[PDB]
Amino acid sequence: PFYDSRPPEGWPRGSVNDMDYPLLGSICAISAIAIAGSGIWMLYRLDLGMGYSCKPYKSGRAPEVNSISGIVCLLCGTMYAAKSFDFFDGGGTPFSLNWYWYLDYVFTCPLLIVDFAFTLDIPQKLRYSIAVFVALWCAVAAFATPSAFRFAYYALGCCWFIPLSLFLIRDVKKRYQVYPPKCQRLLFWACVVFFGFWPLFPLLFIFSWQGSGHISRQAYYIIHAFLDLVCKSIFGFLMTFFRLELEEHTEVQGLPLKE
Amino acid sequence: PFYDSRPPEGWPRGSVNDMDYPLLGSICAISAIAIAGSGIWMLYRLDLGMGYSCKPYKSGRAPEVNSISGIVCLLCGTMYAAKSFDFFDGGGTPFSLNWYWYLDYVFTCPLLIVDFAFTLDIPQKLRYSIAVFVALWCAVAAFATPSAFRFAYYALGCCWFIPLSLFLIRDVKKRYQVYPPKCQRLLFWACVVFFGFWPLFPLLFIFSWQGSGHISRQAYYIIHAFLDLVCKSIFGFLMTFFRLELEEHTEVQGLPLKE
Amino acid sequence: PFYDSRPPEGWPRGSVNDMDYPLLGSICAISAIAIAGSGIWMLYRLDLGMGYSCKPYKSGRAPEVNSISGIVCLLCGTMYAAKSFDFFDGGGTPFSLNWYWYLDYVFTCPLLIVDFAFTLDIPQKLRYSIAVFVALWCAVAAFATPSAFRFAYYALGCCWFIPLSLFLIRDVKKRYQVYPPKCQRLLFWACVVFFGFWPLFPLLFIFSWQGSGHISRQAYYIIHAFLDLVCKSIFGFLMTFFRLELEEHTEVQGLPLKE
Ligand SMILES: *C/C=C(C)/C=C/C=C(C)/C=C/C1=C(C)CCCC1(C)C
Ligand SMILES: *C/C=C(C)/C=C/C=C(C)/C=C/C1=C(C)CCCC1(C)C
Ligand SMILES: *C/C=C(C)/C=C/C=C(C)/C=C/C1=C(C)CCCC1(C)C
Ligand SMILES: CCCCCCCCCCCCCCCC(=O)O
Ligand SMILES: CCCCCCCCCCCCCCCC(=O)O
Ligand SMILES: CCCCCCCCCCCCCCCC(=O)O
């Protein structure tokens, strides 16, 4: 933290920072390995060529944007390693990626939507990416604010998040009929992640310590490990296989989209 | 702030933070709505097509860079909402966009000059955008520094700001003769904003509490609301209409620039 | 700093912040001028045309990416000016670019590798630039962390830094045979800077106050001034002359690469 520190005696018992630090560090360490591990495979696989047939790129190089899926996993995995270091040191360490909720998401979530946009040829990538960015800053503010104005930041966040989700549904509906069936099946599941799991984050806030107070900070850390596995890693596998299926169809078999 | 906080008793009377917080929150709330409102219209209008005749894009998509004007207004408006939240909570709230002068401009001002550069086909966009960025960081430092070194940061800021303003005048003089008369008229007014209102910010510093001490913090907050309306929103309307007039000429009427 | 401040009495004698502040400010001021000075020349020279013969660009504009070398020097020089201001004010000033080791490198080092990548036509520029970025954040954490976990952040940093150095060697080996001999000679020396001086930073950590404790903070500030002169300014001159020699060969003499 910028200001706070763990007392040398340790956090007081029952305080909000009296959590199970070895348990949380363990979960973060395992999450670090799985997510980074998945990112490595994604980048490895991209360099093998186009589609399942692994047809050589004409450039001899894979396209830069295709790396985004794998990179985001490498980034998120690295951040989970840092988070484990903080937890195994007992929390509140100077360089804590655990302390400011959602602060770490300000970098990765705009990359996710950009990746989705390039993969699907959704228009107005600049508009979507900045929208996610601003939304995440609203979440940071909502967790950082102790007063009733935390609800004001929530609503400000929803003014970006809900419009952008509805626009994206609209866009995705337009693209979906373009693609062959095996791509349609992977795009369905990518949609379940985006339109199904992204709304859970604002839903959880309502039961958090900033809302009804039904979910503790410890539980929240565990729940986000799992949500990060789905929204970064599984999501990444879906984008990767979506592209392999597309390339198999268009590049390796030379068939046209139903555009 | 990172360190400071409002006492629970409130700020001491006559302290520098003893301002009229309901007045400032009111002005920020209204500024939030006007500026974001203008951004929404800008994006709406862009999607209607090219020029006044609203001729369909060949891509079926407007160009990404054209969104910059509208996005900057959405961003600035959102930041004014946050600023109102801070003021209505009584100032010094943890997540304050009011506390560090010019910190919020570090994102938006480079976007403004990029927008201007793309709209006018000014060369070396990377050089201009980083120049503005660095200049704004010098302003942040100048307001953050209590000693006589605040003048050192001012001068460092002027080493970027004055060179870049003189280069931009030179560039603008080169483009101005290229364009048809209705574009020339809107470009004149865009220049009045850039070369006329941007210098006011460093001019105001000299009379601020970091200079002669003639202008208070409360007054400064009000003055910047107005300057933000001109430099983001009006500026945004000028870029938008400039493009509509250009496209009417080149795209809808198929006439050539005097290049 | 976010939290700490110099006592008004001054730092206590023998404390870690009891350094020779006029000496450090002097060295930073001189470094500011040389590095920024070199950046100015680089940008000036770029605008003169292609190669030694200064053949006009067909666009009438030099390519944006070519500005990166010069810009990085302007940026690094500006940061050295700020660093001098902090040192001449006696250290620990609110806006200190001296306080958080490596924090200032988080912006400039990714620009260096991008510049190198574009200059040499190395593939996967996104992968290299983010790799450097993440590595530098690991260094920031390693210096910021007082516990034995500083070694954990070091190792995390090495998981990015060593892979990316080995990949880059591999890539550079592929390009080297493409280019004419005078380019080969400048590329050799660019490699001595990258593969020879970049490893020194992690090597120095081991003898720093975060390792064996053989090198003081004062010495570290001086050593980095020199390393910054080599890794930004000299490196910048090498990229510039490499391009002039390439353009003389391909553009002004119209000979083909051995691709
Ligand atoms: C990889 C992690 C992801 C996709 C995280 C996403 C987070 C959100 C969609 C957060 C949204 C919001 C809150 C948690 C509270 C404030 C209001 C929202 C909607 C911006
Ligand atoms: C939308 C807001 C804008 C365009 C703000 C611009 C701000 C500046 C041009 C500031 C300049 C400087 C100071 C206020 C003081 C330090 C020196 C300058 C020239 C960098
Ligand atoms: C212009 C300055 C440059 C090129 C600085 C580079 C810095 C590094 C290569 C730093 C590396 C690391 C440490 C200093 C400690 C943590 C581990 C590393 C390898 C990330
Ligand atoms: C007072 C502040 C109001 C906040 C303004 C909210 C604006 C956010 C909505 C825009 C998101 C849309 C993203 C893509 C749209 C598209 O591509 O069609
Ligand atoms: C000691 C530090 C000195 C600071 C160096 C100041 C350099 C800034 C001037 C460059 C801005 C020019 C922007 C565009 C120029 C162009 O496109 O021709
Ligand atoms: C638990 C965290 C593990 C950290 C993961 C380390 C991954 C970094 C290695 C990738 C760097 C490679 C850069 C370019 C590679 C290429 O272009 O071929």
Author numbering:
A (entry chain A), B (entry chain A), C (entry chain A): 2 to 260
In the authors' words:
Here, we present 2.5–2.7 Å cryo-electron microscopy structures of HcKCR1 and HcKCR2 and of a structure-guided mutant with enhanced K+ selectivity. Structural, electrophysiological, computational, spectroscopic, and biochemical analyses reveal a distinctive mechanism for K+ selectivity; rather than forming the symmetrical filter of canonical K+ channels achieving both selectivity and dehydration, instead, three extracellular-vestibule residues within each monomer form a flexible asymmetric selectivity gate, while a distinct dehydration pathway extends intracellularly.
In HcKCR2, the N-terminal P2 is surrounded by P95, F96, W100, and Y101 with no space for the first methionine, consistent with its predicted post-translational cleavage. Modeling 6-s-cis-retinal resolved this issue (bottom), indicating that these two residues (A136/A140 in HcKCR2) create a steric clash with the C17 atom and simultaneously make space to accommodate the C16 atom to induce the rotation of the β-ion-one ring. The ~220° rotation of the ring shrinks the π-conjugated system of retinal and thereby induces a ~35 nm spectral shift. Swapping these two residues between HcKCR1 and HcKCR2 confirmed their influence on the orientation of the β-ionone ring and largely explained the spectral difference. HcKCR2 thus represents the initial naturally occurring microbial rhodopsin with experimentally demonstrated 6-s-cis-retinal configuration.
